Design an enzyme around this catalytic site. Structure first.
Site, PDB file in Angstrom:
ATOM      1  N   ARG A   1      26.609  75.839 -17.120  1.00 28.60           N
ATOM      2  CA  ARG A   1      26.898  76.883 -18.069  1.00 28.60           C
ATOM      3  C   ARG A   1      27.665  78.056 -17.635  1.00 28.60           C
ATOM      4  O   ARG A   1      27.488  78.124 -16.359  1.00 28.60           O
ATOM      5  CB  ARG A   1      25.545  77.287 -18.725  1.00 28.60           C
ATOM      6  CG  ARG A   1      24.413  78.146 -17.979  1.00 28.60           C
ATOM      7  CD  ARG A   1      23.610  78.537 -18.861  1.00 28.60           C
ATOM      8  NE  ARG A   1      23.064  79.441 -18.520  1.00 28.60           N
ATOM      9  CZ  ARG A   1      21.858  80.208 -18.558  1.00 28.60           C
ATOM     10  NH1 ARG A   1      21.141  79.542 -19.542  1.00 28.60           N
ATOM     11  NH2 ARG A   1      21.273  81.116 -18.144  1.00 28.60           N
TER      12      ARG A   1
ATOM     13  N   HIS B   1      33.946  72.537 -23.395  1.00 24.92           N
ATOM     14  CA  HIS B   1      32.698  72.330 -23.614  1.00 24.92           C
ATOM     15  C   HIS B   1      32.294  70.772 -24.166  1.00 24.92           C
ATOM     16  O   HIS B   1      31.756  70.555 -24.987  1.00 24.92           O
ATOM     17  CB  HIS B   1      31.780  73.088 -23.985  1.00 24.92           C
ATOM     18  CG  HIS B   1      30.260  73.192 -23.758  1.00 24.92           C
ATOM     19  ND1 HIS B   1      29.585  74.464 -23.752  1.00 24.92           N
ATOM     20  CD2 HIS B   1      29.471  72.259 -23.073  1.00 24.92           C
ATOM     21  CE1 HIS B   1      28.219  74.153 -23.158  1.00 24.92           C
ATOM     22  NE2 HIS B   1      28.420  72.916 -22.981  1.00 24.92           N
TER      23      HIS B   1
ATOM     24  N   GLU C   1      31.607  81.761 -24.118  1.00 21.80           N
ATOM     25  CA  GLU C   1      32.447  80.962 -25.113  1.00 21.80           C
ATOM     26  C   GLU C   1      31.838  81.034 -26.641  1.00 21.80           C
ATOM     27  O   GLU C   1      30.605  81.229 -26.759  1.00 21.80           O
ATOM     28  CB  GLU C   1      32.079  79.426 -24.395  1.00 21.80           C
ATOM     29  CG  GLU C   1      30.675  78.960 -24.329  1.00 21.80           C
ATOM     30  CD  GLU C   1      30.513  77.586 -23.900  1.00 21.80           C
ATOM     31  OE1 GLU C   1      30.340  76.679 -24.764  1.00 21.80           O
ATOM     32  OE2 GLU C   1      30.808  77.372 -22.833  1.00 21.80           O
TER      33      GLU C   1
END
Ligand SMILES: [Cl-]
Ligand SMILES: [Cl-]
Lengths: 319, 319, 317, 318
Positions: free
Chosen positions: B238, B285, B267
């Site tokens: 992350r 991602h 993000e």
């Protein structure tokens, strides 16, 4: 005594610094690809000719460079750009760079496999676009490698390095070569007797065959149609093995999910259509381009010439 | 009896087809991220609410969806986005999708490792832009993987899947977890007692550790300095684990050769400097973004609901 | 290793990176040097750091031979360098595109808010000590909520302006030569002609980069097409606006107000502008943030480093 | 026959026209701020008193205007300036103007943020000066908003409208209120349970907390010291929330990069030093100054009186 040498392409600065001390060196400063006429003209008087795969060392080049030319040193594993029949008819010593680039090349093969299967071009483009909408369950869905079949046409030393890396991803290895390999080298890969059989079993079809006149344009409309729908094509060997029209048509129709190419017919004058495809990843012939690999290549040439200067047989001499 | 379900984000067509078979299904067709107020209005009357980590399922959402709402099924490993205190208080059953993401995520970790080290961004950019002058001995030299050390912070299921793929490239595996792994699971990786020890031994430093409050921003100026000069940093866990200022600063001094990132702080509004760095590869991602993995996640939810419908206790029921 | 000459002061942050990387000589006084001053002062440098304020002519390029190999300009444009001359000598030319949108969009909104809400009169009144105090009819301005912002040339800079404008409840209209994709539009209303855009603009805004075709385009006839009471904003190039036309319409009140970051013949701007109460004026500071000027500097540093390792950076002209 | 009304400040011409048509209207033509004795003198006989925040409607004023005065209408959200207990004890109806100012006010807050961060005062002064040397690579560099943290003290209706506009510029929203807002109203904004915490995380520190006595002078030397070096301070709420000595000192010392002020302690008699600071943008309390907002406020008073005349209960009755 200090030999005159001519260097046809710029090499890494560390290797160039060694060549400048080791030889009376003349350099093709602007790094152009010299024509055979250009090479014969510029290199007249050189005893050692430093070349790469971009130099066409024809029978005419070798003769015109006589009596001076004694050694051709190629920064490449391949040597089909040198007229070996002419070289050996005149006792010319030819050096190349065996057994040092397969790891680097296999890295690029796997980069292309991963970028094609998992949509690396669209992925990186999206993040840099400034319009990435954020995570989504259906955002850039790709093909997982686990359980799929990687079919390698021409599974030689570079092909086998690729297979070693590929097995770690749960890819089943399939291949076709003229002759089946021994068990030690096969390591379980599935041997196909014919290219047709290989094409029909390849979820990812990868070209690692060194490339021969007979293979020019072999991956054409008929052969692509034999690959399962939704497959990926990868090329790391030589661009002219692929019919660009056939590949680009299959990418647009989505009979092929995606492609990854490190080599192109007519490079660098590649088919303009490749550049606007979202389902391709492109690399500029960087198979062997690591710092360590390119330096090792240069050192093999230097060491081979040292061995010739002492009347020993170089490990990297091509008969 | 036939349960009403609401789907807040689009799933794969394969999974949506299964859901339509089993539920009176309504779908958020445009695939927008609904606000909590929008979830409450659109899903009103649903017994089963299909969500993702992009849906903020607050106390108010759960209350507004009474009395119909009985089950929340999230297409995610994490459930931070669901107010579990509220769901418990209303007797709501909550399902998630653990332990089926490792292969897909490991493929993206390797994609990032290869593109970072071998300069995938600059490569594709050059060919696509028409500016490639052709193959040359000094063109886009990258860092080879053979003889290098891959250091994995948080080597759990995803981490070990990465180590399996990494070994094929000749990478030596190093790792740091709070507790050392069993001999079986280690497969010879080198254990580092401390994160400091791991950093100092990492030619490629890869973050696979689940995010925690205490880990937020751990990869900062001081810790990057401990990594050997010329290293590569990869993050697939992350984004807020990395100090963007520190990472960007080191990518410029060249203390770090390159980076590969699939996750970013804030993000999708990532640091706007990332897209202007040549020595980075970026993915949006997409770690778990294969049909096979997104389908597997969907099947965990389907199997979970069927179990609940029979009064069984599914293994993916959150307490 | 390399000798470089820097023609204008950059940020202390970027100058430090340049000293670290180059045998650097700087134009300390930061005075705009002449083509002959540059050729003199830069003598021996391999790398020349310039801005749009340096006239890099054929003779500058030729006089700095044989040492000069690279020109690096802190600018999107490269009109000020003789590309034909550079090309014939094999000189590498680097620029800094595509990193200015956030900073420029901030100045666009600044000008929008100051024009609509009378920022000039506001600050002058408080500063002059003549403010009588709050009053229900004091300096009434135009609210943005429910009004239409029309953007001429909505590229990366335009779209950045649109993102910010939306939060103020402005409805977005635009005109480009080719319509944008539905996704990039974000609901903005497309006008296939400039005249249609003008007609629908409560605030009319020039972001269009501007070819020589558009020189002087905002004239008497075109301003007349804008709805009475509108605001005109310009952040692109000064010569796109006919000053007589804008000043006339600001005086007649056909236009409520205007905001300009750029001006025909700058810095020798029309001297009438400074005496208008219904205008806000900024001195071409569109890209003037530390983060943006540093971002531009980093593109040059990255470009030179790529060239040094024999690679082809994306910002090579 | 119809109601006598006194108008203490000039309203917009559209509203005054309407008022002259609906009432026997007397007006403070001069638009001065009337003292409590001046208001009592002028408005004697009035049944309806039209006021603003500048009018101190004390118990004394209200009793001096008896028996006529039965309705006080304030062009303002707050009613602190009206003695409500005095009003209630005489059965006087009070009307105010809630919920119509947030958009106009949020615009001025954003104007201040942009002028402070991007040096609007210096900029416009440079162009008008006649000595602008032309574009330069380091000319008037300011701070970009993208990636910075906007910290809002008292994120109410106004503060939330500011946050809506600020998000578009890539500002991260932080806030401190006495009580945490619901998840729906936060829209992701970061909550600090203490002011100290908020101050320490504000690249731009903005005061939107409606004025109350508890908070007078809250932004002092110690609290500004907690704001990170190079930050901006913005105030659109009430001038006396800021210690002027503290703010001016921190602006001069450059602990603060810049400020934007729409409101000022003792306005209009503001601290004279503010006028000579190059790193400030000044606006004369024009938060709510649009035609649409001031007109809408006026119509609320008018409509509320209409409703009282119909024996109905107006939304805006306090
Ligand atoms: Cl830009
Ligand atoms: Cl208005």
């Amino acid at each position: 005594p200090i030999q005159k040498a001519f260097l046809c392409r710029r090499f890494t600065p560390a290797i160039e610094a060694e060549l400048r001390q080791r030889f009376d060196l003349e350099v093709n400063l602007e790094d152009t690809v010299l024509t055979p006429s250009g090479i014969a003209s510029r290199a007249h008087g050189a005893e050692v000719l430093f070349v790469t795969a971009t130099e066409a060392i024809t029978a005419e080049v070798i003769r015109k460079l006589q009596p001076g030319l004694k050694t051709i040193a190629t920064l490449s594993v391949g040597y089909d750009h040198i007229d070996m029949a002419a070289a050996r008819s005149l006792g010319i010593k030819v050096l190349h760079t065996p057994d040092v680039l397969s790891d680097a090349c296999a890295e690029i093969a796997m980069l292309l496999v991963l970028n094609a299967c998992r949509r690396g071009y669209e992925a990186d483009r999206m993040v840099r676009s400034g319009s990435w909408p954020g995570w989504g369950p259906t955002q850039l869905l790709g093909m997982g490698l686990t359980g799929r079949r990687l079919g390698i046409f021409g599974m030689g030393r570079i092909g086998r390095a690729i297979a070693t890396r590929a097995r770690g991803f749960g890819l089943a290895i399939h291949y076709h070569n003229r002759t089946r390999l021994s068990h030690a080298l096969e390591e379980g890969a599935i041997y196909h007797d014919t290219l047709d059989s290989l094409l029909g079993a390849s979820d990812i079809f990868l070209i690692a065959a060194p490339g021969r006149p007979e293979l020019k344009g072999f991956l054409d409309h008929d052969r692509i149609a034999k690959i399962p729908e939704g497959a990926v094509v990868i090329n790391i060997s030589r661009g002219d093995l692929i019919n660009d029209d056939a590949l680009i048509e299959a990418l647009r129709s989505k009979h092929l999910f995606a492609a990854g190419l490190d080599v192109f017919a007519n490079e660098p004058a590649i088919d303009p259509r490749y550049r606007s495809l979202d389902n391709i990843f492109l690399t500029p012939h960087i198979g062997s381009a690591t710092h360590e690999t390119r330096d090792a290549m240069g050192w093999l040439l230097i060491q081979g010439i040292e061995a010739l200067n002492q009347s020993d047989v170089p490990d990297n001499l091509i008969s």
